[PDB]
Amino acid sequence: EIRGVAFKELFRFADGLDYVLMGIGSVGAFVHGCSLPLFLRFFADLVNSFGSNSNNVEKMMEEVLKYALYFLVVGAAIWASSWAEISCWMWSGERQTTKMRIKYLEAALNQDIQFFDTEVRTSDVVFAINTDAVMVQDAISEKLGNFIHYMATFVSGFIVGFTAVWQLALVTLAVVPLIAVIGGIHTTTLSKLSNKSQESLSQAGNIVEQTVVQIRVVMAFVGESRASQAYSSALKIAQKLGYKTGLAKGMGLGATYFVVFCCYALLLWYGGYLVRHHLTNGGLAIATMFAVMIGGLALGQSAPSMAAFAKAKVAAAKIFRIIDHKPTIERNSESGVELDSVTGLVELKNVDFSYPSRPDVKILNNFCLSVPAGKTIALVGSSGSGKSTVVSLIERFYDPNSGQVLLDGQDLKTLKLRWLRQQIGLVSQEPALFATSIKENILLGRPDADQVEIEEAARVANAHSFIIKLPDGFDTQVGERGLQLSGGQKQRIAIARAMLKNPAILLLDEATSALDSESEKLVQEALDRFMIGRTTLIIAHRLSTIRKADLVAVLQQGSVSEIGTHDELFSKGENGKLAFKDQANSFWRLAKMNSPEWKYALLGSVGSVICGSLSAFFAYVLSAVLSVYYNPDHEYMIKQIDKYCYLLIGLSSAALVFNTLQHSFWDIVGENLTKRVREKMLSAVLKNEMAWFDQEENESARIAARLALDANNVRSAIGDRISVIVQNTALMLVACTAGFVLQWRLALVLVAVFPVVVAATVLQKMFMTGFSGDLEAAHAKGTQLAGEAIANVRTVAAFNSEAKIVRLYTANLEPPLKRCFWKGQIAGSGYGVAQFCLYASYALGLWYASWLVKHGISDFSKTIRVFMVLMVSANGAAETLTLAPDFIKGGQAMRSVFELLDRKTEIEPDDPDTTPVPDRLRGEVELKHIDFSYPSRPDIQIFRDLSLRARAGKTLALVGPSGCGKSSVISLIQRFYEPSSGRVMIDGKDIRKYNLKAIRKHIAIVPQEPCLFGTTIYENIAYGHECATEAEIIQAATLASAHKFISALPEGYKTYVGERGVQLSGGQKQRIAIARALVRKAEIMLLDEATSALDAESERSVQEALDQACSGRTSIVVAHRLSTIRNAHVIAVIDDGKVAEQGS
Ligand SMILES: Nc1ncnc2c1ncn2[C@@H]1O[C@H](COP(=O)(O)OP(=O)(O)NP(=O)(O)O)[C@@H](O)[C@H]1O
Ligand SMILES: Nc1ncnc2c1ncn2[C@@H]1O[C@H](COP(=O)(O)OP(=O)(O)NP(=O)(O)O)[C@@H](O)[C@H]1O
Ligand SMILES: [Mg+2]
Ligand SMILES: [Mg+2]
């Protein structure tokens, strides 16, 4: 594929309206970006007029009113600009993306079939559908507007700073790289530590996933405690990594604060020096500092836009590669050579063909079907022969490279390729129902049909009664959630589609796994005896279909050299309000669980409060310094500025130390809690019935994924997020008290407009994040329909329904387009209103301060201090409200955690109060009057009044047929399942009233699937007995005729084994499992299909090994072949849950 396209190529699908929208959005973004430095300049001018005219109250009042009106104007401009930018950019991006998706799907469906074999795969095409969102609905939708906005902010801030005071602007410009470098180092270290911690968490998740997968053996052989120990060790490694990550984050933030405070101290001293020499005034100095800092931050904030631009260039290069490719069928489908009377004579002629994917091999050979016109052919040959290949050749999916295939004496290469597919009606292995309605699914076979025609096609051919008995009635949306799998009924629908097409020659490929739904009724309906020409390719083990066709024309080896009418069945065969109180109780319970380290939290909280206070003090200092700038006494101003700079240096050191302290302690408690929670979740999971594991929702991978997610999110919400809330509350209190002390009433007016500022700042944070949600989730219906169409491209092209699919795609994509337009309008209007109210609040507060000064109630210094302090308070409160949704999510996750932990188990693995057991049992087992319905199928009851009996030390060899009991017995003898009314007697004792684990220490399991653990075979053998050492390993496979091959391995015992290890043979791993069972040294032995997948010598050796093992101990054996089990005391037979002859 191309490396990338030009940035200007992203706007290929932009029309005039899109150009107008982009122009308006660019203008709005530029004005919105430039507004903030203009606000800083106007604030500086207001402060100058407010502090430089203490003697002249009239002039200062007039100028303060003037600049408050300027603030209102800036607020209105921000409102208009933000509205225009957000709405126009979102809507134009959505429109261009929708057009691009429509044309991409059209081009992909118009492509030739072989294009999906040699060129990009189907999975690549659906991935392109999915990633089109993050490409175009992201780069040109909001990232471009953000880039323009941030360039405007950076340029305007630099211009304002260098036009107000150029010396201070240069100093701040020198300052900015220091903070940039500190932030970059902090982010790099944090990302590295996060990667390491994620790797450790992935290892722990793998451990829990394997435990849940092999819970079959993890419970049978006690050792779920060992799984808990392994999980604890992995979590301890992850906990050390988390401690390192938290310490790194704390040091990074502390260094950032230290550098910021020291640099601002130097800047304030230099500003005082400049004010002394009458080069400037205090307001312009502060505005210059803030404007240059804002410009630097804006320049920093445009990097994600560039990253999105690069990713979009790559993905758009891929999409344009797919779009611009010219299909092969376009020149194949040429001027009208359609006939006027089809007879149904398909002659394959001498043609051979090879797939372009693997041209070396010739799948097709020298043969010709020569389908008789008006008569049915039914070819049955091999499983890997060109049956589906010749089917595709008939429909001209692939152009033959040798010879030619012709219809009614006319070459297929010369036909319409549209009319041709109109004659042939195809039935495939997969019905391939689309996301649209059932009636639309029927209609896409023939677009020029109405409801009566659909009803007659469904009724006369096949049936339609199943459609009526549907929740949605006559018309139903099958989709992916509206309806579920209907089995052969889905196939039924396909047949109906084939019956909406005009009656002609048909290609009916397969009806496998349809039961009676669409085999007998399929051959009865669909005019399998009527019409002209058919090709029934179904094998179905020769389900009487051969007699239907006049000729068989077998396809052995890939040829029809054997053809005619006969009874030769052997056709060769070469191949084949929500509950907040519950949430609060959950927090109380979790914190009670987190008691053993409450002390840590307190110390963290202490750091928390300090940090909050420090922030407040910083604000105060700035305001104080600003006030000191407007003082005629030069020496007094020098002394005050020096004092404030020294205090700021001290504050920087304290901020570094205490910020590191708070982050370290809160991350410590957070990591410890999330670890304790994970251990508790695993311990509760491993103490559940197998039926609980049977639960579909309790999938091994899902069980692991759910655990990880709930653990991490609750951890974050309770540990990292809280520190923020506490420090922000500290800031609020100190800021509030300082304001009402320096100047009350003004602070009261400020706290009155507090919610307005909080809302405006939280909307600013949301704007920084982005005002468009999950774009992939917005186009879910469209993307799943497109994926279904692309995966089934052969069926789409067979029915000539590309245009119908494209128009359905447009119909599915329109509602998201309208929703995006309205969402953009609402978001822009709300953001603009919030910003306008914010600036109105600023103007009102400043004007009230000026009025208070005029009336002699207060002074410039106190009013300015209260103002700045309260504004930083509002910023902190807005940050807290921004972080609150994470607390909501954490509450949901911890509710899930607590409902999992509080779940009770009916079969408790350990019973502290139970009957004691002798060290050595007797070995007798009595399964008396047992019966139960497997939890998977409660409707299907298994076993009726079974009376199985195994004597002390004797061998039982129950066999049965496949699927009738067998394993179920060993799933009940050892309490994997609960009989409805059964009795299990062991050593003259019922097992229900017993400790369970105590006998399961004396039971050995060798299931059908030879499960293996970890990476070394030695530990796999040792799993049977936790104190195996090496002598029992001699008593292991060493003494079970399974030592030669393991010694032949390069590493011997410590040989890499497992899913990621060496894939051993079935017999070798089976005797590994046998060795594990011997190491268990169980008094009661349970064999389970030990002679199923072994070679002759391996089967023999396993036979003597098991015969030696069973000596003197009761054993239950199941095996299909009776020759191995004839040398047993008793043999039992079961069938359909009933008890057959058992004595012999
Ligand atoms: N695009 C392809 N490229 C390469 N090999 C393919 C391709 N499609 C199918 N094959 C293989 O070609 C061989 C011939 O089988 P084919 O006639 O394609 O289907 P089939 O096995 O007859 N299907 P079915 O009738 O359902 O049992 C098989 O090994 C296929 O897996
Ligand atoms: N994991 C399972 N989920 C659902 N049903 C099950 C499961 N395991 C066993 N059954 C049912 O238990 C009954 C008896 O199956 P069973 O004979 O134990 O199977 P098997 O061990 O796979 N047989 P075989 O392959 O001949 O050794 C059948 O109704 C099965 O469908
Ligand atoms: Mg086929
Ligand atoms: Mg089995």
Coordinates of N, CA, C and O and ligand atoms in Angstrom, one line a residue, residues 966-967 1008 1088-1089, ligand 4:
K966 N -21.2 -42.0 31.0 CA -19.7 -42.1 31.1 C -19.1 -41.0 31.9 O -19.0 -41.1 33.1
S967 N -18.7 -39.9 31.2 CA -18.0 -38.8 32.0 C -18.9 -38.2 33.0 O -18.4 -37.8 34.1
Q1008 N -10.7 -36.8 29.1 CA -10.4 -36.9 27.7 C -9.4 -35.9 27.2 O -8.4 -36.3 26.6
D1088 N -10.6 -42.3 32.3 CA -11.6 -41.6 31.4 C -10.9 -41.5 30.1 O -10.2 -40.6 29.8
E1089 N -11.3 -42.5 29.2 CA -10.8 -42.5 27.8 C -9.3 -42.4 27.7 O -8.7 -41.5 27.1
Ligands
MG4 MG -15.3 -38.0 26.7

